[PDB]
Structure 1
Amino acid sequence: SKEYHIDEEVGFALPNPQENLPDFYNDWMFIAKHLPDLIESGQLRERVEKLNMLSIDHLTDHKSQRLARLVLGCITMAYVWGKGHGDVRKVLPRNIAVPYCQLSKKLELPPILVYADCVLANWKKKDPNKPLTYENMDVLFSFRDGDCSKGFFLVSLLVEIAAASAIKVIPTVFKAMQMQERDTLLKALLEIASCLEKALQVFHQIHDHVNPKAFFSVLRIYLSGWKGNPQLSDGLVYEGFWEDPKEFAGGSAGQSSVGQCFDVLLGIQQTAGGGHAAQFLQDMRRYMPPAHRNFLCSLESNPSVREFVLSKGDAGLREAYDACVKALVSLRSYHLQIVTKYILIPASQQPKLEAKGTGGTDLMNFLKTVRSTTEKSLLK
C-alpha cells in the first residue's frame, strides 16, 4: 500500500474514482455517457471522426487520467467493433488516437480497454454511507442496452474486493517468516484461505445479475481486442501516433493482479515453463497499472512461502498452506463452470478450431493448464 497503490477496503480497485471529467473534455464524456444511443442509431463513427483533436495537459490528479483512459477506451472499443456484426475499422482517427496513446504512455498502459479501466475505475456507490454491495453500487459506462454490463463489471469488482481482505495479510506472512513465528504464520495463512473461500461465494452472484446469451452475443465483442484475432490480423492502426498496425490484447481478468498475486505468494509457478499459458500471464502484467506490476515484482523478490512451509515438517502449517491452494483450485474449478455456461453453451447455439477468449488464449486449454498447475502445488 505504501507505494503499490493497494487499499485495505477496496483492494486493487480504485477507491472512489471520479465520475465527471473537467469542463475541457465534455466532448468525450457525451460520447461515452451515451454509447448505447449513438451506436444503435449508427452515428458513432461519424461523431468520433468529426471531433477536433485535444491535448492531455489539463489532467492534474491520477483519478482524472484513469477516467479519461476509461472514456477514451470505451469509445475506441465502440468505434472499432461498432454494431458487433462484422463491419469494423482497421484504422482509428488521429484526433482520438493521439491523446489516448499519449495518456496510455503516461500511465504506462497499452492503448486499449483493460481490466484496470472497465472494472477497477468503472464504478461508484449510490449512497456513500452504505457499504460496498451490488444494491448500493453502479457502473459509470455501458456499451449497449441489455448487455448486462452493470451485473458483469460489479460482480467482477466485488470478487476483487473480496480478495482485498487477503491482500492486507501478506505483510504479516513475510514478517512471520523472517522473525520465525509459526503461530502467526499459521493463523495468517488460514485468514488468507478463509478470505479466498469468501471470494468464491461472491462469484456465485454472477448467475443472478448476468444473462449468458446477452453476455456472449453483444458485450463480449466490445471487450475483445486485436492480438491474434482473425478480424484484425495485422492489428489496429493508430493514425498520427504510430506507423503500422499495432497488435494489443483484449480485456480480461488475466489482467487482474489478484489472480497472479496469490499464485506468486504461495509459490505456484504459473509464469515458469515458457509455454503458451505461462507466456500469456507474464504478458498481461504489461496491461496492469505500474504500481500493481511492482507489487507482483515485490512478492517474487521475497523468500518462498512454499519452501518455508516444506522445510519446517509441520502438519498444521502445510494444512493451512493447502487451504489457500484449495481455495484457488475451487475458484478456478468454479470459473470453468462459468466458462461452460457463458461461452461454451452460447457458442454452440449461434449459427455459422478451438475457441479464442477476449485476451486471445485458447481458453479451455489455457484455464485447465493454469488450474492443473495450481493443483500440483498441493502438499500432504
Structure 2
Amino acid sequence: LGSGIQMENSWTISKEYHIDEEVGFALPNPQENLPDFYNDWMFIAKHLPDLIESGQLRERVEKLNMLSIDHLTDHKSQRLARLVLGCITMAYVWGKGHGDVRKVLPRNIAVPYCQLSKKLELPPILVYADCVLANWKKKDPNKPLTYENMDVLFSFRDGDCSKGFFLVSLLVEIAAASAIKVIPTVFKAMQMQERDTLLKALLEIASCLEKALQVFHQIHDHVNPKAFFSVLRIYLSGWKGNPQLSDGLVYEGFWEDPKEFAGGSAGQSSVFQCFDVLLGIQQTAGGGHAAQFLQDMRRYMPPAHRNFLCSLESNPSVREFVLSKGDAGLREAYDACVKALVSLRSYHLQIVTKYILIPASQGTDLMNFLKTVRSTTEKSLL
C-alpha cells in the first residue's frame, strides 16, 4: 500500500487502473448495444437529434418505464448505459438550448442513472469518460484506429460537430497511450540505474506527446467554431454555479433536494496531469480556487484513473533523478517531454481562444489560467 504504481507483472501496470496498453485512459472496444432489455433507452439516445429538433424528446422520456440496472452485468455494459442515460439527461434538461430548461429529471431516468453512477463512483451528469472515452466504435474491426475508420455512438444535434470534437479528443488520448505504456519502464530504469533505458523511455514519451499534439491539430478540420460554441457546448453544460439551475437538478426518486454537478471541463482528461506528475511539474495557476476546481474535476474522472494519478505522485521523482546527474542525454530527453507538454498546453490555449473565447465575444480568468499553466510548464525546463 502506498508504494507507487501497482504492477500486474514485470512489464505492465496493474489492471486495477483500467488503463489499456493500446487506448490508454479510453475504454477499449466499447460496447455499442445494450441487452434487449434496454432497447427503449437505446432508441431515445440514437434519435436524440431528431427528438430534440421535433420537440419530442421530453415527452418520450416521460413515457419511459423504469428499467432496473440489474441486467448491466459487466463494466462495459455499465459504461454504455451511463453514456446513454447521460446523453438523454443532458438532452432532457437543456432541450433545444434556448432557455426552456427542465429542473426535475423524471424518476424513470433519474433512479437507474443515479444507481449506476453510484456503482461506478461517477457523478450523475455526463462526463469526459462517457462522451469521449466510451463513446466510439470502429467502422471496420480489421482496420486501425484512425478518424476515417471510427465513429461516435451518440450525438445531440445534427450539425453539432460532436463526432469531430469527441473523436479528435479520443484520438489524442489514444496517441498519449503510447506514452503511458512506457511509464513503468521509466521507473524501472531509475531503480536499476539503467541510463540508456531511461533515456530511450523519455525520448519515446516525448515522441508520443509530439504525435498527440499533431492529432489535436485535426480539430479544426472536423469542428466548426460557431456550431461548437452555440450548440454542442449547451449539452456539455451542467448545473453547478449555473444561474439557469441555481440550486441544481432534482433527481426525482433519488434525492429529495436538488443537487449541483458540474458540466464538462478539459480538466476531466487525465492526460495533462499524468505527465505533469511524471515529470514533476506542479501547476500553480489560479491559486487554491483553481486547485479546488481541478481536484473536483479529478473526482469526475473514473476512480481507477484517479488512483493511477495518485500512485504516480508517490513514485520516485524522475525530475530529481535527472537533476542528480551531469548527464546531457537525460536532461535533453526530460526536456523533450516537457517541451511537448508546453506545446500541448500552448495549443490548448489556442483552441479555447478560437472555439470558446472568440465565439463568446461575437473570460479573462480563463485565458490567464491557460497562459499561466503554459509558463509554469516552460519554467520546468531543466
Superposition TM-score, scaled by structure 2 size = 0.93
| Structure 2 contact 30–134 (Cα < 8 Å) conserved | yes
> CA-to-partner distance for each residue in 1:133-166, whole Å, 9 max, x for gaps?
0111001000001111111110000011000000
Structure-1 separation of matches of 2:285 and 2:326: 26
Shift of 1:272: 9.8
Judging changes above 3 Å, is the alpha-carbon distance between structure 1 residues 339 and 119 closer, same or farther for their aligned structure 2 residues? same
Shift of 1:232: 1.4
Q: How does 1:123-162 map to 2 (within 5 A)?
A: 123-162=136-175
Structure 2: distance between partners of 1:84 and 1:364: 26
The change in CA–CA distance for 1:179 and 1:106 in structure 2 (over 3 A counts) is: same
Secondary structure in 1 aligned to 2:31? coil
Structure 1, residues 188-227: CA drift from partner, whole Å, max 9, x if none?
A: 1111111101111111111111111111111011011111
Counterpart of 1:374? 377
CA contact (8 A) 1:215 1:342 kept: yes
Deviation (angstroms), 1:236: 1.2
Q: Is contact 1:277-1:370 (8 Å) kept? A: no
TM superposition shift of 1:50: 1.9
Deviates more, 1:263-272 or 1:173-182: 263-272
Could you tell me whether the CA contact under 8 Å between 1:224 and 1:250 is conserved in 2? yes
Deviations 1:277-329 (A, max 9, x none): 22222111211112111111110111111111112232221221111111111
1:231 is aligned, of 244, 247, 257, to: 244
Shift of 1:35: 0.1
Kept in 1: contact 2:286–2:369 (CA 8 A): no
Tell me the equivalent position of 2:106: 93
Measured against aligned partners, the alpha-carbon deviations of 1:242-300 in whole angstroms (never above 9, x if no partner) come to 12221111123311111210011111123799522222221112111121111111101
Q: Is the 8 A contact 1:112 1:248 kept in 2?
A: yes
Q: CA deviation at 1:333?
A: 0.6
Q: Which moved more, 1:280-289 or 1:64-73?
A: 280-289
Could you tell me whether the CA contact under 8 Å between 1:277 and 1:369 is conserved in 2? no
1:84–1:218 contact (8 Å) kept in structure 2: yes
Residues 24 and 180 in structure 2, CA contact (< 8 A), matched pair in contact too: yes
Contact 2:353–2:367 (CA under 8 A) maintained in structure 1: no
Q: Within 2, Cα distance between the matches of 1:237 and 1:124?
A: 33
1:365 Cα deviation (Å)?
A: 3.2
Counterpart secondary structure, 2:250: strand
Mapped contact 1:82–1:88 kept (Cα < 8 A): yes
Deviation at 1:361, TM superposition (A): 11
Query: C-alpha distance in 2, partners of 1:108/1:242?
Result: 17
Equivalent in the alignment of 2:11: none
Q: Mean alpha-carbon deviation: is it higher for 228-237 or for 264-273?
A: 264-273
SS at match of 1:3: helix
Cα deviation, residue 45, structure 1: 1.2
Structure 2 contact 93–101 (Cα < 8 Å) conserved: yes
What is the alpha-carbon distance in structure 1 between the residues aligned to residue 326 and residue 263 of structure 2? Answer: 44
Contact 1:39 1:82 in 2 (8 A): yes
Alignment match, 2:131: 118
SS at match of 2:15: coil
Whole-Å separation in 2 of the counterparts to 1:185 and 1:218: 46
Q: 1:361 to 1:81 in 2, by over 3 A?
A: farther
Counterpart contact for 1:177–1:308, Cα < 8 Å: yes
Report 1:351-366 matches (<5 A).
362-366=365-369
Q: RMSD over aligned Cα, in angstroms? A: 1.7
2:206 and 2:336 in contact (8 A); partners too = yes
Give the drift of 1:368: 2.3
Q: Deviations over 1:48-79 (max 9, x none)?
A: 12222221111111110000000000000000
Separation (CA, whole Å) in 1 of partners of 2:272 and 2:108? 36
Deviation at 1:5, TM superposition (A): 1.2
Q: Compute the TM-score of the two structures, normalised by the length of structure 1.
A: 0.93
> Following the alignment from structure 2 to structure 1, what is the Cα–Cα distance between the partners of residues 378 and 93?
39
Change in Cα spacing, 1:369 to 1:273, as seen in structure 2 (3 Å) is closer
Q: Which moved more, 1:33-42 or 1:365-374?
A: 365-374
Tell me the alpha carbon deviations over residues 95-145 of structure 1, each in whole angstroms, 9 at most, x when there is no partner: 111110100000110000000000010000111111010111001000001
Is 2:285–2:373's contact at 8 Å kept on the other side of the alignment? no
C-alpha contact 2:249 2:259 (8 A) present in aligned 1 = yes
Instruction: Please give the alpha-carbon distance, in whole angstroms, between the structure 2 residues aligned to 1:363 and 1:273.
Output: 9
SS of the residue 2:20 aligns to? coil
Counterpart-to-counterpart distance in 1, 2:373 and 2:240: 21
State the secondary structure of the residue aligned to 1:14.
coil
Distance in 1, Cα, partners of 2:94 & 2:54: 14
In 1, are the aligned partners of 2:186 and 2:201 still within 8 Å (CA)? yes
Cα 1:332–1:149 shift into 2, 3 Å: same
The answer (yes or no) to whether the contact 1:255–1:285 under 8 Å persists in 2 is yes
Contact 2:239 2:263 in 1 (8 A): yes
Whether the 8 Å contact between 1:271 and 1:281 is mirrored in structure 2 is no
List structure 1 segments (4+ residues) > 4 angstroms apart after TM superposition.
271-274
Aligned CA distance change for structure 1 residues 272 and 337 (closer, same or farther; 3 Å): closer
Contact kept? 2:285, 2:369, Cα under 8 Å: no
> How far apart, in 2, do the equivalents of 1:271 and 1:81 lie?
34
Name which of structure 1's ranges 318-327 and 66-75 shifts more when overlaid on structure 2: 318-327
The match for 2:9 is none
**Cα separation, 2, equivalents of 1:272 and 1:301:** 22
